[PDB]
Amino acid sequence: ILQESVLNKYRTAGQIAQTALKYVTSLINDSYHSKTTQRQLTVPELCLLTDSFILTRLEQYYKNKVNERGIAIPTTIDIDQISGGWCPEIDDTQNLLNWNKGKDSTFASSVTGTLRPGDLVKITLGVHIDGYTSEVSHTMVIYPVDETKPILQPTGPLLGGKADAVAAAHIAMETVVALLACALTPEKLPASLGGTSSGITGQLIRTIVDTIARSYNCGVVPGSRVRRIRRFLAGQNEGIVAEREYKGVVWTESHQEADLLSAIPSDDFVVQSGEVYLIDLKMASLEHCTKKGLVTLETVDSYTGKSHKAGELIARPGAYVRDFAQTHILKLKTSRQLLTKIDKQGVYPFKLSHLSSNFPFVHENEEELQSLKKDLKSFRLGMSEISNNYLCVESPIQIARWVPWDHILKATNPNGNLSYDATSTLTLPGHELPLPKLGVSAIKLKSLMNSTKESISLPVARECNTIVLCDSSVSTTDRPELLRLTGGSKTCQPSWIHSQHELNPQDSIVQGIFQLATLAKDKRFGLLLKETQPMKQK
């Protein structure tokens, strides 16, 4: 239930998230675009600096007034085919180099930590105060800097499928934000889009997002969601921890199958006032796919000895999730002390470096970094026994993959629905049906993906914001309005792209999208969006 104090806690979390996103954007621009910095920063350094900045900023807010506050989502930097879960520690850089020596260079940016021109860099971070969570995620583009222009600018706009994915994600984000804002004043919903006297539904959300994705020739990655957020329940680990109640719309391989054939989440709800909504949309480009196929996810392991595929990425996930329902008294004193530190963090995913007493840095020092690494060695020693007794689990690294439909149809599964992954460590992904109508299990689909020679990895663009549907008493302006805690025109400004694809205006859904854009621009009689501003540091 929205209140002045609850809204203020959400607002402060959103402000800290916006400031952190501006910080990472400035760091990346200085390292790769401005080039004032002598040595370019790497991805683990950027993640660590972002986390330290967030902790330093959050130290001053709600101190000695709130039991639990901290980082909700660790800083994740995903490049191209990687659709989530990439937050490596600083002590795994040489590990990554040694594990990926002799592989292809398709994941060279992730392996070396150094960004390259043409990269789609997706930055995700979240902040919670008293369990009230605000999460932001922005795709940006890395460009070569033109040496001839007096001012710094890209030589040319980004072109191709990555540009299509960025455009689709940005336009879907804006349209969904406007559509969810329309729930407060339902009469302003366009007639071509849906019923004037009726509200916003998950069916309308899904058909709008699918229409935008199909227009821009992109698929929706099966991790996308437009869901409701409560205290401590923000989907911070959605594929790992089951939830009692779910109110939102999700996209899966089952939904892709149903669209082709045209506590379980269902799109049979009505958006209500006084609610907080997370919108996380991942769009994968389908430019290189000459036929109709299915978009799925591939989990990255750290074992180089499982295959001979030179186009494989070998890495260890850096974010862990504590399972508070599991208890086991450990044998190592280091492991027991680490578990005591872990239980202080709460119910959000955490990095091993977040548990260091040296972290966050008061002054950025080489000695501070070295003491952090010295802590991290014993932290890994304790984490080995913690993970062995199922007290904590890894947050997976996932690569988007494309599997054609003809290979799936020609394949034979002798088990049907009965097959499942017995070696899987987590319950929720281990027993899953990605293709319920075809009777294909997750293990069977992974086997098909590995068996096909024409299964490729699709570039992904991501946009994720948090919004509040503020009622008239809740809002300052005496009218219902949408408060965007994260994202907007100041932090998530789109990069220079040029996409040949476009929305086709001769469709009712596209006309409703254009009218939603018009009514969002209309600041007099239309809808009211209040963006949350990043704060100044000096």
């Binding site: 460009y143 706009p157 054939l261 149809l409 400004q493 789109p494 990069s495 220079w496 792209i497 040029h498």
Partner: peptide, 26 residues
Amino acid sequence: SSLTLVKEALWSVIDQGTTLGGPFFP
């Protein structure tokens, strides 16, 4: 067979522009 009918239907169903941003680094 319902599975066979589903597979047959699947086989049947499978058988300017836009510009964002500008010449600047946000």
